Amino acid sequence: PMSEKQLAEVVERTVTPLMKAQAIPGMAVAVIYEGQPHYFTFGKADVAANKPVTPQTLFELGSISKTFTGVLGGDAIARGEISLGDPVTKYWPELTGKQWQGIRMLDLATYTAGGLPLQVPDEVKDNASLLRFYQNWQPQWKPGTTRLYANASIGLFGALAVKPSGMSYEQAITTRVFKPLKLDHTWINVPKAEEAHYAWGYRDGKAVHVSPGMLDAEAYGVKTNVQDMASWVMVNMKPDSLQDNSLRKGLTLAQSRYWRVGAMYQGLGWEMLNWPVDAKTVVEGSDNKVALAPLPAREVNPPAPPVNASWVHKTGSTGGFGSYVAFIPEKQLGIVMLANKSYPNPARVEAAYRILSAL
């Protein structure tokens, strides 16, 4: 749809019926068409105060934060600070239990350690109870064979990836990823001074924000607006637009293919499927029944480097937010849909597919 008004129609005709069917109060959308961002905003950021969602509105990324984690882990690898090959145990010597070896930083980054759970238990409030949690976890499968999507796996990869830098996770991500990329309105903790832009999420008609949790920043804690989210997409769509540094290499590593699961490839945070892609395959693959299930995983020897003809995406949720990102570097086409209501993942994928297959 060359025209911006044609673009706006393609977005609205899908988004509006989506908000009504899913009772979503607000949504901020970014379409990257020919490499340029275009913003479309709908509904409310704050339903009580009647605030509209604009491109300055901060949304909780939820699991999309994992794409930042991935790229931060890739940047530490290009720096020689950590290697995916390494035993987890070289970054956490207190993890002495026998189930732990054979388990590599790679298995943590890509949910392939043998069954770490979806969520860190809420009983776990500090470093000691977290240590005890991993010491007492019992694998259901051998390491490096089974993929089970997990905050407890990549959350730990993130916290461990950053220890060689001497920086806290918040400081590492902010200095090595957010700032260099000029994502100045992307945070782990939203400043009090910027709170006014922070949308409320809606769970059962209740306004909520994500609750503190162990490994939250690492697994589901980034907050941004659609402007920074669009910049994040354009930069991951075209890394070669960067300076051959550690971060450029990092972005390349995050979209490398480490495992093949069904019709998808597991990158660091990012997930990819060969483009063109059947709508049925991608929408159904995002259902909880498949995406949250344990699935056999075939390791790619020498991780395959990025293929431009991919559907690269990530769905991210918190209790009050539902967001989705998908891009095709080949066509330089992308979409970001940030919403303040966590609605089914298949509906996010379906909507983005519908908008993207029309451009």
TrEMBL record:
Residues 11-358 form the Beta-lactamase-related domain. It catalyses: a beta-lactam + H2O = a substituted beta-amino acid. It comes from the Bacteria. Its EC number is 3.5.2.6. GO terms for cellular component: outer membrane-bounded periplasmic space. NCBIfam families: bla_class_C (NF033085), blaACT (NF000385), CMY2-MIR-ACT-EC (NF012173). This is Beta-lactamase. The lineage of its organism: Bacteria, Pseudomonadati, Pseudomonadota, Gammaproteobacteria, Enterobacterales.
